[PDB]
Structure 1
């Protein structure tokens, strides 16, 4: 996160840190708890990931220093990547992780609500991007979970900012015209959470952008409301 501040413990209880153990253990991507065995993240996180056996999901973490060999995590049973996904810049940048065990809900770890189909017309005024990513393009994974409040940008304005790309309605952009506050390397897959009628909704999945927090280069997120039926298909299968 560029231009962010340290979060408080339990502020984003749906935020997870997805680690890979190959070749050594390290933070790979952010993610969100959406169900007791379901993590919603970005499909691009799994480039070259051959098996779910190298993945570890950590919930209820404020600081990366909380994670040692003895720290409990959730194993990943299945990686489900959207069938139409090719690359982040083309859309469909969405994946589900089916966990090997159930997440026990509490004040440190709980699910974020998916946006409603009726909430497609609603205007979100209080949106936040969170993660352990870089603070500048050449930086490092941060110890403490950072947060930044960012305004949502219309599809029309976002398309003006990205000539040469096709910004579809399955994408949602966010950022200040002048830049300064945005997601950066290591934040991808994490949430873009918006508070509406005192309830937090998973509005976007941190996906891509040209650089980090650049003037007139908003962050591009998977527009979660457009994938609600896909999420239900995968998580509510008979």
Structure 2
């Protein structure tokens, strides 16, 4: 996260840190708890991931230093990548992790509501991007979960900012015209959480941008409301 501040413990209890153990253990991506065995994240996080066996989901984490060999985690039973996914820049950047065990909900770990299809018209004015990602292009994973408040950008304005790309309505952009606050390397897969009528909604999934927090380069997020039926197809299968 660029231009953010330290989160307080329990502030984003749906935020997870997804680690890979191959070749050595390290933070891979962010993710959000959306159900008691379900993590919603970005499809591009699994580039070169040949098996769910190398993955570890840690919930209830503020600081990466809380993670040692004796720290509990959730194993991943299955990686579900959207069928139409090719690359982050072309959209469909969405994946589900089916956990091997159930998350016990509490004040440190609980789900974020998916947006309502009826709320496709609501204007969100209180949106935050969170993660342990870089503070600038050449940096390192941060110990403490960071947060940054960022305004949503219309599809038309985002398309003007990304000449040469096709910014679809399945993408949602967020950023200041002057830059300064954004997601960066290591934040992808994490949530873009917006508070509406005292309820937090998972509006976006951190996907991509040209550089980090650059002037007139909003961050591009998977527009979660456009995938609610896809999520229900995968999580509510008979």
Q: TM-score, normalised by structure 1?
A: 1.00
1:69 maps to 2:69: yes
Q: Provide the rounded CA distance (Å) in 2 between the counterparts of 1:153 and 1:37.
A: 32
Q: Provide the rounded CA distance (Å) in 2 between the counterparts of 1:62 and 1:17.
A: 10
Q: Provide the rounded CA distance (Å) in 2 between the counterparts of 1:139 and 1:84.
A: 32
Name stretches of at least 5 consecutive residues in structure 2 with no aligned partner.
Answer: none
Q: Secondary structure at the match of 2:165?
A: coil
Deviation at 1:104, TM superposition (A): 0.1
Q: Provide the rounded CA distance (Å) in 1 between the counterparts of 2:214 and 2:199.
A: 30
Match of residue 210 from structure 2: 210
Q: Provide the rounded CA distance (Å) in 2 between the counterparts of 1:191 and 1:213.
A: 17
Deviation at 1:70, TM superposition (A): 0.1
Deviation at 1:186, TM superposition (A): 0.2
Match of residue 111 from structure 2: 111
Deviation at 1:135, TM superposition (A): 0.2
* Equivalenced residues, count: 238
Q: Secondary structure at the match of 1:18?
A: strand
Q: Secondary structure at the match of 1:227?
A: helix
Match of residue 47 from structure 1: 47
Q: Provide the rounded CA distance (Å) in 1 between the counterparts of 2:87 and 2:105.
A: 33
Deviation at 1:94, TM superposition (A): 0.0
Deviation at 1:32, TM superposition (A): 0.0
The 5-angstrom pairing of residues 139-150 of structure 1 reads: 139-150=139-150
Q: Secondary structure at the match of 2:233?
A: helix
Q: Provide the rounded CA distance (Å) in 1 between the counterparts of 2:234 and 2:134.
A: 32
Deviation at 1:90, TM superposition (A): 0.1
Cα-Cα RMSD: 0.1
Q: Provide the rounded CA distance (Å) in 1 between the counterparts of 2:7 and 2:97.
A: 25
Q: Provide the rounded CA distance (Å) in 2 between the counterparts of 1:7 and 1:55.
A: 25
Moved over 3 A (4+): none
Deviation at 1:176, TM superposition (A): 0.1
Name stretches of at least 5 consecutive residues in structure 1 with no aligned partner.
Answer: none
Q: Provide the rounded CA distance (Å) in 2 between the counterparts of 1:140 and 1:148.
A: 17
Q: Provide the rounded CA distance (Å) in 1 between the counterparts of 2:165 and 2:33.
A: 30
Q: Provide the rounded CA distance (Å) in 1 between the counterparts of 2:119 and 2:75.
A: 33
Q: Secondary structure at the match of 1:228?
A: helix
Q: Provide the rounded CA distance (Å) in 1 between the counterparts of 2:20 and 2:189.
A: 14
CA deviation map 1:66-88 (0-9, x unaligned): 00000000000000000000000
Q: Provide the rounded CA distance (Å) in 1 between the counterparts of 2:232 and 2:2.
A: 33
Q: TM-score, normalised by structure 2?
A: 1.00
